[PDB]
Amino acid sequence: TSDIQTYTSINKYEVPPAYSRLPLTDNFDFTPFNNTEYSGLDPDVDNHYTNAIIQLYRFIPEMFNFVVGCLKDENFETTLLTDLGYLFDMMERSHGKICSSSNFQASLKSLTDKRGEPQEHLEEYLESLCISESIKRNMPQKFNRFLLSQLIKEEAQTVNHNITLNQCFGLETEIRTECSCDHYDTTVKLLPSLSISGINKTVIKQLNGQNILPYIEYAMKNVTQKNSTETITQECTVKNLPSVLSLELSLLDTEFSNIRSSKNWLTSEFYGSIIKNKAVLRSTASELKGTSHIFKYELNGYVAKITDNNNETRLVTYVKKYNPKENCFKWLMFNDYLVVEITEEEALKMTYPWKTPEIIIYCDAEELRKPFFSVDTYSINYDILFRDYFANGEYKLLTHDEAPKSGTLVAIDAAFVSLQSELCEIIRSIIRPKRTALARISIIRGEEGELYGVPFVDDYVVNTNHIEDYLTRYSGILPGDLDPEKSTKRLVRRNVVYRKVWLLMQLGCVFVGHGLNNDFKHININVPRNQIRDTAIYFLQGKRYLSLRYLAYVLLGMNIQEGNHDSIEDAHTALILYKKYLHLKEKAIFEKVLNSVYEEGRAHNFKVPE
RNA sequence: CCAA
């Protein structure tokens, strides 16, 4: 993959490798694709267009500090809001490590299955999951308006209901539709984004061609004269300059081709206020008449559509970030997992024909220079680690004297199920394997004491989606995972069980188990290597890993006689194995019994009668 | 292969 992060091409037509279709993601190496301390997203997703938008909103300080801040309280009902907060917090703390948005994608697919007048907004987003072209037109802008609308709707349903997202994106739109003479009707609705679509009077590129500001002025105050056998006159006007401006560019290809020639069209920064019943936007303050509270706006980021030379379509994200240790603006470009730091002259330049701006974001001046606040800047509510929150009808819950600290030993094991299969297209060129879901996890008390080796959660994860295979032999999940059909296990949602794991790694607990990197990858949570004690890495044999049942029969006297797997018992045996490994390490017998399990396994064929 |  040499010469793949080059974002510039000497030719104005050849698309550089930084925007090409990245190779599909046993252990994929991401070190030659990201050198910065800001993470990328796993391209193995059902949505061809949501990864670019998530990165666009991560670097808006006023939104990022809020949705991450919403992780103080247990907002289990706001699925799309908290899952976005779980993703934003994970992205910030990974500092470059790969991240997956499968949890957010699952909450979006379950929310869009809703079967308000504009309900086709749900169906238009659901129609873009089964993947034909990669992404259609006007579809990224449709989700941009959909994501912001659903977030605000969930923002009013959180604990201590907030309106912070409305104060940032709120566009007080006056919709005057004149039916007859001297008699008109006005509508006032708060819009999260501004839609620049269906432009008719292209009088902008003469002397106001020109820059982007005239397009924003028309979308803020326009008079359309088309409706129906009526052809009514409609006048849309906004009287609000919010903190951030969400722009949705959807123009004609003739207007898109003419807009590439105008150098410096997409303006870096501008200022403007409201003087008349319309909004005026000027480059410098010398053109501003003043007489009102002036507002300064700077570009935060934008999502552009890349048309490959192989006639392939994909989205990328340009991003600016401010460092409080100096006065500097660093640009960042985001492919799926390709992240590079670029210059401003290249980020604003759009003379290339394979580049089309789709979603632009402008931010307030004094608010962009504000630093990003992590979730651990407030007091988080660790009440779920003790409460019994089940959705149905041999462990023991936790107490406040067992309050986990930075270093509390815990044994974790997770069971999963199969929703779909590989479902590939072919040499493989289009499709990828997907759809593995979580069924049951269990955390065990690992701290030495009276309550040692005894679990404290045994939660099963409810799932309404159609499964393809239970993997019952390796999952121990009888068909009782249905919400009203719980056989014997106490069920729980996915948002509640994820918070138990998130709070454990938030405090700094130390997880032990076998193959913990797999569970955390499918649970969709990233834990630092300092808090992971994997028995596979410890008892590693070159490139071969040993089965947990085998180690229980060669390192201990526990012949499990494995029939139906049992996660609560699997995590228990993984805990005491870490205790034996500690014993065999304190006394210098480390690389003496490890060599004993290789050779004894050659004649035994890595198996024992069970 | 491990994980499942």
Curated annotation (Swiss-Prot):
Contains a pseudo-UCH domain. This ubiquitin C-terminal hydrolase (UCH)-like or ubiquitin specific protease (USP)-like domain is predicted to be catalytically inactive because it lacks the active site catalytic triad characteristic of thiol proteases, with residues at the equivalent structural positions that are incompatible with catalysis, and it cannot bind ubiquitin. It functions as a structural scaffold for intra- and intermolecular interactions in the complex. The keyword Metal-binding applies. One of its GO terms (cellular component) is PAN complex. Positively regulated by the regulatory subunit PAN3. Negatively regulated by PAB1-binding protein PBP1. Inhibited under stress conditions. Inhibition of deadenylation under stress increases mRNA stability, which may be a mechanism to retain the majority of the cytoplasmic pool of mRNAs for later reuse and recovery from stress. Zn(2+) binds at residues 181, 183. Binds 2 metal cations per subunit in the catalytic exonuclease domain. The gene is PAN2. The keyword Nuclease applies. Present with 1510 molecules/cell in log phase SD medium. This is PAN2-PAN3 deadenylation complex catalytic subunit PAN2. Forms a heterotrimer with an asymmetric homodimer of the regulatory subunit PAN3 to form the poly(A)-nuclease (PAN) deadenylation complex. Residues 14-365 form the USP domain. Keywords: Cytoplasm, Exonuclease, Hydrolase, Metal-binding, mRNA processing, Nuclease, Repeat, WD repeat.
